[PDB]
Structure 1
Amino acid sequence: AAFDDAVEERVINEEYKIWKKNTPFLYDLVMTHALEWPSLTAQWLPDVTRPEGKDFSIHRLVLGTHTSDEQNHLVIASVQLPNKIEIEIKINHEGEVNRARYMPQNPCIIATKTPSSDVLVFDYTKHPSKPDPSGECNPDLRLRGHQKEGYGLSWNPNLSGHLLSASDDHTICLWDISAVPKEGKVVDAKTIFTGHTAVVEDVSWHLLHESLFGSVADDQKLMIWDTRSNNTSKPSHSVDAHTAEVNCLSFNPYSEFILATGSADKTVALWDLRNLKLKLHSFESHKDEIFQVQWSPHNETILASSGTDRRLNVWDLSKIGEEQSPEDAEDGPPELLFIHGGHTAKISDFSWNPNEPWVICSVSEDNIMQVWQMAENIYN
């Protein structure tokens, strides 16, 4: 018992040695940073500073902590990228930061998921950069509605202040904070959606249609919801998406009918909203549960996925069905563009840089943050 956890470490350490050796051929950029505590969350902020006549630019990241019995913080870090990684702000946070997402219409506004089931809202410019030594958490809003913690969190990019949240209590909560002064008010949910019968793992608004969002859960279902519908216990569409828990979904930012889901069944599924009866494709190479899937912000055929097998896989759906030499068919399907092997623990989250194509930040349970970019010859 618990012995196989010892040799898998030995094999992990050997494959990481090989990966370090090959980085000059596979990567145009690799930066590794160890955080004091692991982050469960990562997301690039949308703005960049390009200081006068210097060869780099400064990008920022929302991170959090996951401590054991120590004060937690919401974290803004800065990264220098060519055309250094420093913590810039820590805000006191009650419990670990399950997930933090900035508001598209105002990226100073950051929503977080707490273990106590509260969803918190910070305007990070309304807080000192060094946290209150009391440790007391002073969020700008507290959003009530859940009875248990959760993970999914999604701001509507077309209706400002309309925030979705998924929870282990089997529900999805909607808040509209748009006319609520950000002075520590408590806001209860406008609507709670109850279609799922199990933990709801993720939720996401459609990028174009202001009334449409999807949810995925441990009941193996993808549900498509319309906020214009009066029935909140039954979604517009409900699909048996996977043979196990569905942990994540992402709408394609360029293709309004396409989305992707990732699952404990170790696959990423591709979906067309016009016919949810037929899975479009199943991306298979992961060796364990997938927890994050994200489409590229620059390239409509590119998406990436990560999870417990410590790999981050980048997929190119324009390559589905192309011929391979049997030596090439070895490493996997043609639509597998790249496998990032730099992490040695479960990957907790990743984010594509919105301003520097092909740059990704990924964070893992062993406190590692990596900012990396695969070699340009790999995506031509």
Structure 2
Amino acid sequence: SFDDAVEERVINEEYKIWKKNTPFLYDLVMTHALEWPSLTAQWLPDVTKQDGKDYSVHRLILGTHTSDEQNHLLIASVQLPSEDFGSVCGKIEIEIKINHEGEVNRARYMPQNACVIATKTPSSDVLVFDYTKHPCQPDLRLRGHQKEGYGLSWNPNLNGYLLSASDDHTICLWDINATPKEHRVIDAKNIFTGHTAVVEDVAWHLLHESLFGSVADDQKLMIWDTRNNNTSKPSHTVDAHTAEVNCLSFNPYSEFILATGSADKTVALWDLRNLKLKLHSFESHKDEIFQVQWSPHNETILASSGTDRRLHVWDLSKIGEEQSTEDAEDGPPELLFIHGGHTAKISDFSWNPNEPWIICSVSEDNIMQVWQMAENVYND
């Protein structure tokens, strides 16, 4: 159609421009086309090195989206710059592969033992694998609910405790260590309802093992306390957004600050000490927002991605500082950087935990990008 065509046209012309400015806007930009689109992406904690090599190796947990052929759980190794047949391999390879029944919606490793990877299937089961066992039939099948989902959150502080969101208006909680397994199957320690609609995302508080937050299409943010008795009584409910809320992430350097992304094209800043007053609303995205992640290195900065094909990076510290018109355009002072290297909807992204400022983002066209904005943008 005409609109599709016009759209596709602007996307290319803009991309054209982007690529030309690459050396000016970035310090690192790596593009790579997977054989299949990945809906998930998360960096693994470890870093591998060799003496004499000008690079270190990092790894990502990716997935495949084949609405046909066989799907797999992937582990990709990426070579990253250091302080400075039989030929040298490419900077990106797929070290591990694991047959997975259906697309991989999410895939997160367990903080306590990253050999453990939890998965979100297009089914209603939640799978668990140990990529030390398959070196495929999951090592654990988590019962819990009737619908598909994406929300997935491992609890630090409590080995094994996993949370999940679902299109069936509920949240499940399991103890992966679950005594017995009755045929690789662990039922569900608790099911939190309290949500009028589809639950988009879920996330554990980072310090208090009994707290966690949920987010759903009912336009609300709910804070829960595992200790409470009513599996329908969220200890708190917040009218967070105009549209449906798609995610929430806790600030790594705080025990109160939180963030949420909505279809209302907005990212809301929240403080647990007073969920009655929204601290701020980051605006600029032109379509739905599905991912929001805080920098693992700076308490003041977070990023968001969505359907508008843009990855935004914000800086709380610049909220409110005055800016010069015709500069006061392009966006508010809180918008530190805009990543326009993706040519399709960004499905998910992850901040590298060892290399401050490196981000990996997977797009729907099955493109993967490892990038780092130019130092000057966040320095001087």
Tell me if both proteins adopt one fold, taking TM over 0.5 as the criterion: yes
Task: Call closer, same or farther: CA 1:183–1:109 in 2, change over 3 Å.
Answer: farther
CA distance in 2, matches of 1:80, 1:232: 46
CA deviations 1:97-134 (Å, max 9, x no partner) are 0100000000010000101111000001111xxxxxxx
Query: Contact conserved, 1:138 with 1:184, CA < 8 A, in 2?
Result: no
Deviation of the 1:13 alpha carbon: 0.3
CA distance in 1, matches of 2:106, 2:2: 32
Deviation of the 1:54 alpha carbon: 1.0
Query: Contact conserved, 1:143 with 1:186, CA < 8 A, in 2?
Result: yes
CA distance in 1, matches of 2:180, 2:377: 49
Q: Which secondary structure state, in structure 1, belongs to the residue aligned with residue 8 of structure 2?
A: helix
Higher deviation after alignment, 340-349 or 174-183:
174-183
Deviation of the 1:180 alpha carbon: 4.5
Deviation of the 1:178 alpha carbon: 2.0
Query: Contact conserved, 1:141 with 1:183, CA < 8 A, in 2?
Result: no
CA distance in 1, matches of 2:47, 2:163: 27
Hey, what does 1:348 align to over in structure 2?
Answer: 347
Deviation of the 1:256 alpha carbon: 1.1
Task: Call closer, same or farther: CA 1:254–1:224 in 2, change over 3 Å.
Answer: same
Q: Which runs of 5+ in 2 are unaligned?
A: 82-89
CA deviations 1:128-185 (Å, max 9, x no partner) are xxxxxxxxx4111011111001000000011000000000010000001125468961
CA distance in 2, matches of 1:98, 1:200: 14
Deviation of the 1:46 alpha carbon: 0.5
Deviation of the 1:373 alpha carbon: 0.2
Query: Contact conserved, 1:59 with 1:81, CA < 8 A, in 2?
Result: yes
Q: Which secondary structure state, in structure 1, belongs to the residue aligned with residue 61 of structure 2?
A: strand
Q: Which secondary structure state, in structure 1, belongs to the residue aligned with residue 164 of structure 2?
A: strand
Q: How many residues align?
A: 370
Query: Contact conserved, 1:347 with 1:364, CA < 8 A, in 2?
Result: yes
Query: Contact conserved, 2:168 with 2:198, CA < 8 A, in 1?
Result: yes
Hey, what does 1:332 align to over in structure 2?
Answer: 331
CA distance in 1, matches of 2:67, 2:210: 40
Query: Contact conserved, 1:140 with 1:184, CA < 8 A, in 2?
Result: no
CA distance in 1, matches of 2:254, 2:94: 36
RMSD (Å), alpha carbons? 1.4
Deviation of the 1:3 alpha carbon: 2.3
Query: Contact conserved, 2:178 with 2:186, CA < 8 A, in 1?
Result: no
Task: Call closer, same or farther: CA 1:291–1:15 in 2, change over 3 Å.
Answer: same
Matches within 5 A, 1:255-334: 255-334=254-333
Task: Call closer, same or farther: CA 1:181–1:92 in 2, change over 3 Å.
Answer: farther
CA distance in 1, matches of 2:230, 2:7: 49
Query: Contact conserved, 1:39 with 1:364, CA < 8 A, in 2?
Result: yes
Q: Percent identity?
A: 93
Query: Contact conserved, 1:215 with 1:223, CA < 8 A, in 2?
Result: yes
Deviation of the 1:357 alpha carbon: 0.3
Deviation of the 1:68 alpha carbon: 1.9
Q: Which runs of 5+ in 1 are unaligned?
A: 128-136
Q: Which secondary structure state, in structure 2, belongs to the residue aligned with residue 150 of structure 1?
A: coil
CA distance in 2, matches of 1:216, 1:225: 11
